Amino acid sequence: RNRREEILQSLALMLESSDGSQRITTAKLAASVGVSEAALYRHFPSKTRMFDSLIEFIEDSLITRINLILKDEKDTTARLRLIVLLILGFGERNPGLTRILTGHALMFEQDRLQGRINQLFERIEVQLRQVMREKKMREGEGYTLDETLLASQLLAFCEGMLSRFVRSEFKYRPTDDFEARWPLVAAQLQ
Amino acid sequence: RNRREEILQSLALMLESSKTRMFDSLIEFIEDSLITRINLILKDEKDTTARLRLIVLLILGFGERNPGLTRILTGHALMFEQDRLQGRINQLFERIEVQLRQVMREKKMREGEGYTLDETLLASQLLAFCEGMLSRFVRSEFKYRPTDDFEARWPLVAAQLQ
């Protein structure tokens, strides 16, 4: 219920703390919300389910935000800019959810969790190639380079920004100087 | 030599299963290997652009040939005791980035025309490229080789440098 949400947010926070270089315990978490260790399981069968709900929140957020973009912008280049900004801003506002995107927070959790993350990225990348291909349908003159290279190139930029954000201890924010960086990234597109 | 790498890269994967000390000595080796290699590059190529190319190839190739050592550069391997170790790795990237910036700054004196953009931005752009590739190499379980299609990717990354 309402308590369910309040439990996930506490975890995302702990995931961004030193806990991530460690291991979140059902004990350390039930008190955060105040409820009993047992009452915690009334909303979550296990700690793994909590991660899933977090991963699921992540995919819903990204996927849904991307869909909106494609309806507010008809331009290919502008759509690409927004998708990257979207992934960088999301990370920045959710330092804990980023440690999952980067895998660091899944090291001592069900390796199956990394799988979901890996599938999510492929999903992102696939959406990115789909967008770039349409440039020929929208602008006639499309990209003279394979969309698979371009899309991966872009997602690598995003992942590299998130990775630098995590290791630096959230010091180097993903969006800092984004608009100054984007033109350099767009220069890679053809 | 390269043999002193396969052995240590093999050591890193083994310890993930004092340990802190070793990982520290390993972070030292990684630095010593990367720094030395970059210096040698600056002696075989005078061209700024080509120098930037070789330095990125170096980082990518090193990681690719040492999956266990990349796990350290990406921090994943330091996720069990962590803390200070990740900090030393951070200092490693700061050293690489700095080197990257110094190289970039020499374009004006060497070729005449420099960059219209701040070297701090460009350097962090190339290093972000490398960290993205490396990180995707780890989460893919070493399937996405960091250098795959490098020569096709490099002209694009170079397009960001004026």
Give which of A87, A102, A103 is closest to A174, Cα–Cα.
A87
Tokens representing A188 are 């890679």
Q: Domain A1-190: what homologous superfamily?
A: Tetracycline Repressor, domain 2 (1.10.357.10)
Contacts of B153 in chain A (CB under 8 A): 149, 153
Q: What does the alpha-carbon distance between residue A168 and residue A165 come to, in Å, rounded to a whole number?
A: 6
Amino acid occupying residue B24:
D
Residue-by-residue DSSP string for B48-96: HHHHHHHHHHHHHHHHHH-HHHHHHHTSGGGTTT-THHHHHHHHHHHHH
Stated resolution in angstroms? 2.3
Experimental technique for the deposited model: X-ray
Tokens representing A162 are 């998130």
CB atoms A103 and B139 under 8 Å: yes
Name the minimum distance, in Å, from the CA of A117 to any CA of chain B.
9
For the beta carbon of residue A53, count every other beta carbon within 10 angstroms. Answer: 17
Residue-by-residue DSSP string for A49-104: HHHHHHHHHHHHHHHHHHHHHHHH---HHHHHHHHHHHHHHHHHH-HHHHHHHTSG
Residue A163, classified by CB atoms within 10 Å of its CB into exposed (0-12), middle (13-18) or buried (19+), is buried
Contacts of B86 in chain A (CB under 8 A): 21, 167, 169
CATH 3.40.228.10 fits B1-162, yes or no: no
Q: Domain spans of chain B?
A: 1-162
CB atoms A160 and B130 under 8 Å: yes
Contacts of B152 in chain A (CB under 8 A): 149
Q: Are A80 and A154 in contact (CB under 8 A)?
A: yes
